[PDB]
Design a binder for these strands. Structure first.
Lengths: 128, 70, 74, 135
RNA sequence: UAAACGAUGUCGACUUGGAGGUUGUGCCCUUGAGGCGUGGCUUCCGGAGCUAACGCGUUAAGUCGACCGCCUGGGGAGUAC
């Protein structure tokens, strides 16, 4: 389970605000909102949204999550946001939204997926 | 997987999304997967495959159509 | 043209410099991307002997931190 | 003999300090029978990638002709260092003594143009943010 | 050691072409991401023609010469002595 009569009234840090980060893979999606100094204020995923196994890899979920991430950051008081997006999994404008929705806020879009020059790694997984 | 905006930057009401960016992606891929010396020409690049293919098909279609035959 | 040529300028369609480059940058803007990679010949019709020399450059730059290489740098 | 371009990047910061150190650099090759061809810089800047722990930064070239086995002395002079943060040599087939497109541009760029990146700003400023009297 | 590649020993002349790539280079009522000239290298298609056939085909597996290496059922076997 029940629940209170009630709810909640409340915030907490009231940050106004921040950035958020979306990462996601084949699987799953994690959403973390920061705050800003990098942080976090809330995170969420989705697996944590209750889907779960394989599902947590889906764009539905994630969009759920995020919505949830957010929420959560309602207790941390975002007004708002900017968004950084990573990895080959789900993404998106509808995943942004959700941020948003909630009423936050968001304009922002960027995303920042890592690309090394590479080495470092993947496996030869499985087989073909 | 979202497009960079940022140049602009849309409002919030709004889209975003348009045009997309230089995203998606890199070392991807070798993920999972795997490397080979010549096998990438059918594994992946593909195309070698193609290619005259399309010219083709344009010849075809002329054709067909045309004679239609189609 | 003819005994006249050169001039009459002829082209340079694609590429505008036909050279290695690196002093710059930007002309080399573009032949780079939003994720630090070079632009392939592909897309330009350059070219290539000048693709590459352009890229490189570009390489470089980046190895003089004048252009981005991954993304992240952008 | 080799003929060389030599570009280097100065910590911002030291950008007004290295123009009093050019003797260092000449040097190195004038001791080595080499010569200067380049001396320009460009102002500052932006990098991207920072060098450090700063994104800015001051670009200069000298560049020279160098003896082919004595050039490195100039590389070793930069690296020991610091500041000069970073430097590069190429490469010039006796080349290219002219610069560069940003000096040929100057401005048009800067006035206007633009740039893209950059750091002229910064720098500026710095007049603040920078002050030195020792070496 | 290799499916160590043209799956094709090295060298050289001759014998229909077309289309694409690359590069030293001739000239250019210089126009273009181009036009025509002259060599080197190269990829795809294919005539004559050869080949059991697939295939190869002016970079031959067509037309020819010199020098060199290899073959004479399968299994026993690149195994033993």
């Amino acid at each position: 389970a029940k629940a209170p009569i009630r709810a909640r009234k409340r915030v907490r840090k009231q940050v106004s605000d921040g950035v958020a980060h979306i990462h996601a893979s084949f699987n799953n999606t994690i959403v973390t909102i920061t705050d800003r100094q990098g942080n976090a204020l809330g995170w969420a995923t989705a697996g944590g949204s209750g889907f779960r196994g394989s599902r947590k890899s889906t764009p539905f979920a994630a969009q759920v999550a995020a919505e949830r991430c957010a929420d959560a950051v309602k207790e941390y008081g975002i007004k708002n946001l900017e968004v950084m997006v990573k990895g080959p999994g789900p993404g998106r404008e509808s995943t942004i939204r959700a941020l948003n929705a909630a009423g936050f806020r968001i304009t922002n879009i960027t995303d920042v997926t890592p690309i090394p020059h590479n080495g470092c790694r993947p496996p030869k997984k499985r087989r073909v | 997987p979202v497009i960079k905006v940022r140049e602009n930057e849309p409002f919030d009401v709004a889209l975003r999304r348009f045009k997309r960016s230089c995203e998606k992606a890199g070392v991807l891929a070798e993920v999972r997967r795997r490397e080979f010396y010549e096998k990438p020409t059918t594994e992946r690049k593909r195309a070698k495959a193609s290619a005259v293919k399309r010219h083709a098909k344009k010849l075809a279609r002329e054709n067909a159509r045309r004679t239609r035959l189609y | 043209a003819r005994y006249f040529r050169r001039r009459k300028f002829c082209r340079f369609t694609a590429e505008g410099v036909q050279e290695i480059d690196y002093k710059d940058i930007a002309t080399l803007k573009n032949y780079i991307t939003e994720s630090g990679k070079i632009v392939p010949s592909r897309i330009t019709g350059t070219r290539a002997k000048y693709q590459r020399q352009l890229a490189r450059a570009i390489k470089r730059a980046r190895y003089l931190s004048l252009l981005p290489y991954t993304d992240r740098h952008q | 003999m080799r003929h060389y371009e030599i570009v280097f990047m100065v910590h911002p910061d030291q950008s007004e300090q290295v123009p009093g150190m050019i003797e260092r650099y000449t040097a190195a090759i004038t001791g080595a029978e080499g010569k200067i061809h380049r001396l320009e810089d460009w102002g500052r800047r932006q990098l991207a990638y920072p060098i450090n722990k700063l994104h800015k930064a001051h670009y200069v070239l000298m560049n020279v002709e160098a003896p082919q086995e004595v050039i490195d002395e100039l590389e070793t002079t930069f690296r020991f260092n610091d500041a000069v943060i970073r430097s590069m040599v190429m490469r010039t087939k006796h080349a290219v003594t002219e610069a560069s497109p940003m000096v040929k541009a100057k401005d048009e760029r800067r006035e206007r143009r633009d740039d893209f990146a950059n750091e002229t700003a910064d720098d500026a400023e710095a007049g603040d943010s920078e002050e030195e009297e020792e070496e």
